[PDB]
Design a protein around this ligand. Structure first.
Ligand SMILES: NC(=O)c1ccc[n+]([C@@H]2O[C@H](COP(=O)([O-])OP(=O)(O)OC[C@H]3O[C@@H](n4cnc5c(N)ncnc54)[C@H](O)[C@@H]3O)[C@@H](O)[C@H]2O)c1
Ligand SMILES: NC(=O)c1ccc[n+]([C@@H]2O[C@H](COP(=O)([O-])OP(=O)(O)OC[C@H]3O[C@@H](n4cnc5c(N)ncnc54)[C@H](O)[C@@H]3O)[C@@H](O)[C@H]2O)c1
Ligand SMILES: [Zn+2]
Ligand SMILES: [Zn+2]
Ligand SMILES: [Zn+2]
Ligand SMILES: [Zn+2]
Lengths: 374, 374
């Protein structure tokens, strides 16, 4: 039995920046009140995990990363009512406490219970459930899914269809939802509109899917890696261009391709140069630009306010505007009904033990999404 | 008669920056096809005209400024069909050609025929109708209203109720429409929301009026000049604050007064610091900040994209988002129908020949709007 007891299992621990993960033997404390301990089944490799490794995203170390996943509830702490042992679930990197100003506001989703703005690397009560070799290990985004077992706050856990193919839907835990929603919830792409998507990783490609579903007439995919183009077109890109092929700035090229600029531009990479280009490429009077990629720590853009005064709308969001706990299940039901597929996004499958190899592929540009199995 | 002939009249010419205006005899050529010659009756003094004087906004010189006004049609060139001699009309600093991409888009108003983005100081055909001392004189925003007679493009002239009090309705040509519309069309203030308004000039007080109309439960007026607070309250502000009274940055004060920041913030001054503070005071997850004020030439804001990634919406606009030709007449009709008064905004009245005195008043801070009568 394991309920009420400390769990000993394997987890991928990051001891320091710019080093490989080390698969360690770790101890996982039982769930406290309003906490859920989950046996992990599958985890997707997202660039945000990698940002911590590269030092581009700050969070307290040592730590167990991982936030895009699906598992089975092993046990629940006292007070828990939304999930029970055996349920299939998806941890949410941005919770939905349902009690703060944001959660009450129908237009926002950045729950105040988050651990993104100023990471503590703990659960909501401010403590850690992880220990390894006599040392406490930090949580990441309240989820830490690069571990056979993890403890997450209830409001950061969603119950999903029991028949769910956990090795597929784990992408709904982050990449798909974020990309797709940035188009449908955040930007609010209108039918017959023109869009531009910067970055064709699992998130950017989902953004491409979102634009198509919203009914865009033109979806121009932009990426410096041409091997991402077939998938982009497969998912709805009407055009694919590579900035490296041109002599003039990419924003000028884009504007000249769309009568002054696209209606909706999305930055889905995490760089300042492309965030700028993306803003500059949407029409100065009727364009909307959405920041989706996480920028490098404290890096600042330099913009002339005039760019906005003409009529531009510049926004950003996490999770594609989806209120995590309510949105994830609906999205899974949609997947189950075949409204959309994630096959094209899953390029590689590897056992959790080969996690480092999973990151190598991300670094190589050969993978879109590598799903790890436990 | 003057029809078909060159008009000799008085006009306020600016031959160089940071110098007073020069009331001189100027010649006004007859209107070309699709152009409208107007006998000016009243013009409000807007900070945008002053920007040119101070060097803060560049436009070719010599020039005749003036863009917030109301007059009577003297004559129309061939092809003109929307106005006739004797009609009361309001010139528009942003046109509504009705045929370009922007005009066709229901949600945009920055017509491509504008002369703001990259000033030529001419009418839409690239030439000028003014001459003075044997030399041509430039137009400003296609209106040039600091003149007894001015010629404007038809799509930049709106016909209004024949019983309209021109000495009041003139404000509807810029400041009132911009400020009010910024709240009602650009920000789309929701009932029961919280707002912050930086700048309590004629445009800012109009923003306050806009927020009240939209049903804001809370409207915080921000200004370093406490003499504006009486009018702010009179116009709808629930509280007024002067940054000079605090040790902490204003955005921090604003956030702490409003549970993490207001739902809507407006910058109606034209400064980087206030523009930054304004963006920072809207709630990180559900706030919207709108740029109304025009920033000094080529100055840039340094911004961390993370301010947007949490959920903030940053936007700007001209004319309060109103499609000028359709919008202005309806606002005049609302005024006629007593829906809103403009008396609180007009604090001084002077004849056109004392234009320099009205600007002195603007600089001194003793006036909201000074109206010049011809
Ligand atoms: N807002 C959110 O909630 C949220 C959620 C998930 C991920 N993200 C962020 O999304 C971003 C992308 O995520 P991913 O997992 O899909 O990343 P990814 O690395 O798999 O793919 C990004 C793409 O950008 C392309 N690219 C890189 N540099 C380029 C450049 N200079 N110009 C043009 N293209 C270039 C790459 O070739 C790659 O195809 C990351 O920054 C991640 O942090 C945000
Ligand atoms: N977007 C547009 O279409 C549009 C239209 C009209 C005017 N504008 C611009 O809007 C802005 C305001 O116009 P106005 O005519 O009402 O100007 P104004 O000079 O009369 O009013 C500015 C107000 O802001 C206050 N203020 C100045 N500096 C401040 C500071 N550092 N901190 C706090 N408060 C400060 C001033 O005391 C004054 O009360 C200007 O930039 C003008 O060019 C834009
Ligand atoms: Zn992610
Ligand atoms: Zn919440
Ligand atoms: Zn137009
Ligand atoms: Zn003005």
């Amino acid at each position: 039995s394991t309920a009420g007891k400390v769990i000993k299992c394997k987890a991928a621990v990051l001891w320091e920046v710019k080093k490989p993960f080390s698969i360690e033997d770790v101890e996982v404390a039982p769930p406290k009140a309003y906490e859920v301990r989950i046996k992990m089944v599958a985890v997707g490799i997202c660039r945000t995990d990698d940002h911590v490794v590269s030092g581009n995203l700050v969070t307290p170390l040592p730590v167990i990363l991982g936030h895009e996943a699906a598992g089975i509830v092993e046990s629940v702490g006292e007070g828990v009512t939304t999930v029970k042992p055996g349920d299939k679930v998806i941890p949410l990197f941005t919770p939905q406490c349902g009690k703060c100003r944001v959660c009450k506001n129908p237009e926002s989703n950045y729950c105040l219970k988050n651990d993104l703005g100023n990471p503590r690397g703990t659960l909501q009560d401010g403590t850690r459930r992880f220990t390894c070799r006599g040392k406490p290990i930090h949580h990441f985004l309240g989820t830490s899914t690069f571990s056979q077992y993890t403890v997450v706050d209830e409001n950061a856990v969603a119950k999903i269809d029991a028949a769910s193919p956990l090795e597929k839907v784990c992408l709904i835990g982050c990449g798909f939802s974020t990309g797709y929603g940035s188009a449908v919830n955040v930007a609010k792409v209108t039918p017959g509109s023109t869009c531009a998507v910067f970055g064709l990783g699992g998130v950017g490609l989902s953004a491409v899917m979102g634009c198509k579903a919203a009914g865009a007439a033109r979806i121009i995919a932009v990426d410096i890696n041409k091997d991402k183009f077939a998938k982009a077109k497969e998912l709805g890109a009407t055009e694919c261009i590579n900035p490296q092929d041109y002599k003039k700035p990419i924003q000028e090229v884009l504007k000249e391709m769309t009568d002054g600029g696209v209606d909706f531009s999305f930055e889905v990479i995490g760089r300042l140069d492309t965030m700028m280009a993306s803003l500059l490429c949407c029409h100065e009077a009727c364009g909307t630009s959405v920041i989706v990629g996480v920028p490098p720590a404290s890096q600042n853009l330099s913009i002339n306010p005039m760019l906005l005064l003409t009529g531009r709308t510049w926004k950003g969001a996490v999770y594609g505007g989806f209120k995590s706990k309510e949105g994830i299940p609906k999205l899974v039901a949609d997947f189950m009904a075949k409204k959309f597929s994630l096959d094209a996004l899953i390029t590689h499958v590897l056992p959790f033990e080969k996690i480092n190899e999973g990151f190598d592929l991300l670094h190589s540009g050969k993978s879109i999404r590598t799903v790890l199995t436990f």
